Design a protein around this ligand. Structure first.
Ligand SMILES: N#Cc1cnn2c(Nc3ccc4c(c3)CC(=O)N4)cc(Cl)nc12
Ligand SMILES: N#Cc1cnn2c(Nc3ccc4c(c3)CC(=O)N4)cc(Cl)nc12
Ligand SMILES: [Cl-]
Ligand SMILES: [Cl-]
Lengths: 4, 123, 123, 4
């Protein structure tokens, strides 16, 4: 999971 | 403020290809000369300008069989259909002309681009 | 010996979400209490262990309406349905419990994982 | 396009  | 799962789109596409391999929820047969290819209309539209136009048509949207132009090569179509469902393009010296012609007909601009670049490098 | 187009899976998913927004080729309505959500069975199966089981069932595969357990929160479902079609999860303090419960019911393991990690960090 |  990432900060887009 | 959303978070994003990097591999989600690839995982979805992998499962769509699994559905295709098992012939689950396929709703169209694409006929290319003597060959038939089962697929999901939604995936075809998502990948191809030609299928996007065909399946948004108020009459063609309901057809279970679509016949492609007799000049379309079945192997070229097969390679592009595999690409649609996997992101992988089996581009070879022996098939590049057929793949590029099929990609132009199907309106798959990124495939056409790369075929053009691979051909330009060999001349 | 294939080449691969990096953005292909994301581009496919973007077009599947466009089809959902325009209600094109949607083949199921998911009923969550008083709310209804139209979707494509193939995308639901590709994202959820629950829908994969439901739509591979020889009888349920043909249903146009699926009713979820009355304990399922419509907003939580809405957030997860958006995630399925975009890879983006709108996870907030006010909805995390509902999202995690919905993801457990829908069998969306990666979403459950992250909800567990975000909850553990706040305690 | 890349070599996967
Ligand atoms: N709704 C919808 C929807 C479903 N599919 N789809 C598009 N599919 C498409 C149209 C043109 C081209 C390609 C894909 C690849 C290419 O080279 N050209 C576009 C839009 Cl703007 N919308 C949609
Ligand atoms: N054919 C087919 C096919 C269509 N969909 N699909 C799967 N969908 C799925 C099943 C379980 C889980 C998820 C997705 C996300 C998650 O957390 N669990 C799996 C397989 Cl092995 N195959 C398929
Ligand atoms: Cl393309
Ligand atoms: Cl997930």
């Amino acid at each position: 999971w990432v900060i887009p | 403020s959303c978070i994003q799962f990097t591999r989600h789109a690839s995982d979805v596409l992998l499962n769509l290809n699994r559905l295709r391999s098992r012939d689950i929820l396929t709703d169209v047969v694409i006929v290319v000369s003597r060959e038939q290819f089962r697929a999901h209309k939604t995936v075809l539209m998502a990948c191809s300008g030609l299928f996007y136009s065909i399946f948004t048509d108020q009459l063609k949207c309901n057809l279970s069989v679509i016949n492609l132009d007799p000049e379309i090569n079945p192997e070229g179509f097969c390679i592009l259909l595999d690409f649609m469902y996997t992101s992988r393009l089996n581009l070879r010296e022996g098939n590049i002309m057929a793949v590029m012609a099929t990609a132009m007909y199907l309106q798959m601009e990124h495939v056409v681009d790369t075929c053009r670049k691979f051909i330009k490098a060999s001349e």
